[PDB]
């Protein structure tokens, strides 16, 4: 418990004071991650800091006259050279480099440290599973899985100068809104946890493990829900997903009485006087931020995202409209019924959900 507490304190200090962007602080940060580092003088005006590990080599070009980083290059010693370290922006011909941006657009090393920790994770845990190859290809397999399953989700890599596979929905204004981020994290619970390569087969329309011999140990594929943030939190039925797949449960620590705002809305008589609210939930609502979607759990991505989208479009809007100061409104886990007037369920199309909310708003206004 001393080592775990010390590591937690070290993580807290690293996050609380990331340090200023200087060549010395970048070198110290790389050395703190166990990266080999050397500095070369390319010219009287230019110095290069080169940092290396098992697979990754990072060259950082520093302009001595301007006191500024000029360029950053990632090179892999893998047979896979096609690792995307650029931001995916639609319509810019200049692929903006994530590592360079993390050192030029931010006031501190926090953005660079997080991106370097991610590259170091892939480096440490890549062998015959190549995680640089697999993580690149996974973004294509997820995009295909959504096309085959008729899911209206867009897949982008590398959003806002951060490594990750981002899942976007169309918002009300046609603006793309991130729903979730998929990335690899170290499995703190089980160092013997086998992480396999799963490919989405176009032929079977399923995830398949082609090579059960290709695994890495002590890594998990994590799906993080991107909250736009208590009303913007996503709540799940306690039995919606197996508790073994829940990495981060937001425990409302026992000294602030924040029920789900949903459950406080079954307890507090401050309703729209036109609606009698009926709760038909059989399970408790829990706030989940992170899911383990490793191995056979890749099928759950579409189910989790449909719930997140339904919860945002239907549940959160119903709650907002009921909470603003007689028709019966029945709210259950997968269906909502407004007397004999309108209903919608979790398995209906987004167009049915929008029509339900429009009709509900017209009645409640």
């Amino acid at each position: 418990s001393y080592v775990e507490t010390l590591d937690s304190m070290i993580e807290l200090f690293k996050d609380y004071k990331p340090g200023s962007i200087t060549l010395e602080n970048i070198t110290r940060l790389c050395q703190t991650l166990g990266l080999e580092s050397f500095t070369e003088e390319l010219s009287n005006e230019l110095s290069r800091l080169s940092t290396a590990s098992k697979i990754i080599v990072i060259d950082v070009d520093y302009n001595k006259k301007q006191d500024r980083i000029q360029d950053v290059k990632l090179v892999l010693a893998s047979n896979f050279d096609n690792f995307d370290y650029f931001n995916q922006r639609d319509g810019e011909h200049e692929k903006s480099n994530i590592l360079l941006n993390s050192l030029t657009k931010y006031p501190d090393l926090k953005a660079f440290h997080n991106n370097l920790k991610f590259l170091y994770l892939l480096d440490a845990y890549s062998h015959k599973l190549d995680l640089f190859k697999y993580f690149t290809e996974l973004s294509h397999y997820i995009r295909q899985c959504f096309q085959d399953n008729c899911c209206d989700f867009k897949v982008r890599t590398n959003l806002n100068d951060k490594f990750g596979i981002y899942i976007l929905t169309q918002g009300i204004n046609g603006k793309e809104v991130p729903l979730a981020k998929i990335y690899l994290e170290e499995n703190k619970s089980d160092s013997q946890y086998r992480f396999y390569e799963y490919i989405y087969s176009q032929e079977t329309k399923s995830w398949i493990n082609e090579s059960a011999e290709n695994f890495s140990n002590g890594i998990s594929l994590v799906m993080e829900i991107v909250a736009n943030a208590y009303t913007d939190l996503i709540w799940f039925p306690e039995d919606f997903i197996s508790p073994e797949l829940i990495i981060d449960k937001v425990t409302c620590s026992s000294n602030s009485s924040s029920s789900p705002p949903i459950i406080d809305l079954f307890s507090n008589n401050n309703y729209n006087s036109r609606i009698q609210l009926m709760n038909d939930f059989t399970t408790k609502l829990i706030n989940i931020k992170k899911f383990d979607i490793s191995n056979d759990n890749l099928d759950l991505i579409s189910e989790i995202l449909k719930w997140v989208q339904w919860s945002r479009i239907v549940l959160q809007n119903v709650f907002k409209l009921v909470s603003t100061p007689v028709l019966q409104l029945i709210v259950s886990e997968d269906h909502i019924i407004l007397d004999t007037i309108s209903e919608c369920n979790l398995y209906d199309d987004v167009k049915c959900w929008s029509k339900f909310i429009e009709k509900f708003q017209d009645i409640v206004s």
Binding site: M9, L12, F13, Y16, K17
Partner: protein, 83 residues
């Protein structure tokens, strides 16, 4: 005697005071080889407050300009006095 009272009146004096207190707590913690996070975070936020007050002191020059215009005032008064 009133000098120290005036010095204690300005905030950055209290700022250096509790910054010293926070480092005293930190050194006591490391002496016990039991580093407490709250002490270090208090130290860093107090240092930040010190540094913002360091900027706030700089925009000094207004008092100096008031001082020169005061000298102009009394020299004009003396000139008109001998007149």
């Amino acid at each position: 005697t009133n000098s120290e009272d005036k010095l204690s009146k300005v905030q950055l004096y209290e700022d250096l005071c509790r910054y010293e207190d926070t480092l005293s707590k930190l050194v006591e913690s490391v002496d016990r080889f039991k580093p407490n996070l709250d002490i270090a975070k208090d130290l860093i936020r107090t240092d930040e407050a010190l540094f913002e007050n360091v900027k706030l002191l700089a925009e000094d020059n207004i008092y100096r300009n008031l001082q020169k215009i005061d000298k102009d005032s009394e020299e004009l008064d003396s000139k008109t006095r001998k007149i």
